[PDB]
Swiss-Prot record, chain B:
Function (record text): Subunit of the fusion protein that is processed upon entry into the host cell. Mediates fusion of the virion and cellular membranes by functioning as a class I viral fusion protein. Contains a viral fusion peptide that is unmasked after S2 cleavage. This cleavage can occur at the cell membrane by host TMPRSS2 or during endocytosis by host CSTL. In either case, this triggers an extensive and irreversible conformational change that leads to fusion of the viral envelope with the cellular cytoplasmic membrane, releasing viral genomic RNA into the host cell cytoplasm.
Organism, as annotated: Severe acute respiratory syndrome coronavirus 2
Origin: domain of life: Viruses
Protein name: Spike protein S2'
Consequence of changing N8K: In strain: Omicron/BA.1
Impact after mutating T11N: In strain: Lambda/C.37
Length: 98, 100
C-alpha cells in the first residue's frame, strides 16, 4: 500500500504498510456459463457459488453480485470450453423495460 | 586433490543446508505455485484450479481469457513439447552450466 521512511544514524528505516487477506472460505468455481448456447465469461471477477445459485466477485474480497450482462461478455458457442455449467445469465433490460 | 588440499590445514566447512533439504524447498515452492497461483507469497495459500490461474496470467499480458479457454489443448501440447526439448538440451552435452 505505502511506506514511510524514518531516519537513523548511518542508515535509514522504512515502515512498509502491506495488505494481507485474512480468513477464507472454499467455494465451487467454474470457467463459464452459457445461457443460450453462447458462453459468458467474467469481465474481471470469477464465477462462484454458495452451492445453489451463482455469482461473480472480485478476486480478493468475497462480495457477490447477480450475473448481469454488464460484468460479463460473450465469445461464441458453448461447446468448445471445458467445465462450463448450464445456468441463466440474468439480464436487466427486460425487467426495466416495463 | 581433495586430501592434498586437506593436508595443510585447508578445510572445507560443509554447507549448512544439505542438497536434499534444498530440493525439498524447491518442491515446496513448485507445489505452491502450481496450486495456489501467486497468492501464497501474501499469506496462506489458496487452492484454485490451474486453468483459471493460467487465464488470469493471460489477462496479465492483455489477452482476454477466451483465447485460453478455447486453445487449452493446444497450449498443453506446446508446453509438453517444450519441456521435452528442455530435457534434451540439458541431457545433451550442450553445456549451459559454464556459469557454474
Amino acid at each position: 500500500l505505502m511506506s514511510f521512511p524514518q531516519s537513523a544514524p548511518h542508515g535509514v528505516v522504512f515502515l512498509h504498510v502491506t495488505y494481507v487477506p485474512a480468513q477464507e472460505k472454499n467455494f465451487t468455481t467454474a470457467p463459464a456459463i452459457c445461457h443460450d448456447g453462447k458462453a459468458h465469461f467474467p469481465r474481471e471477477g470469477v464465477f462462484v457459488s454458495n452451492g445453489t445459485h451463482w455469482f461473480v466477485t472480485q478476486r480478493n474480497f468475497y462480495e457477490p453480485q447477480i450475473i448481469t450482462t454488464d460484468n460479463t461478455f460473450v465469445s461464441g458457442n458453448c461447446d468448445v470450453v471445458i467445465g462450463i455449467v448450464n445456468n441463466t445469465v440474468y439480464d436487466p433490460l427486460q425487467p426495466e423495460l416495463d | 586433490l581433495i586430501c592434498a588440499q586437506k593436508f595443510n590445514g585447508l578445510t572445507v566447512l560443509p554447507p549448512l543446508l544439505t542438497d536434499e533439504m534444498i530440493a525439498q524447498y524447491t518442491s515446496a515452492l513448485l507445489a505452491g505455485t502450481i496450486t495456489s497461483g501467486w497468492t501464497f507469497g501474501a499469506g496462506a495459500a489458496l487452492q484454485i484450479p490451474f486453468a483459471m490461474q493460467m487465464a488470469y496470467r493471460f489477462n496479465g499480458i492483455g489477452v482476454t481469457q477466451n483465447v485460453l479457454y478455447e486453445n487449452q489443448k493446444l497450449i498443453a501440447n506446446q508446453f509438453n513439447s517444450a519441456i521435452g526439448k528442455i530435457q534434451d538440451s540439458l541431457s545433451s552435452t550442450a553445456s549451459a552450466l559454464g556459469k557454474l
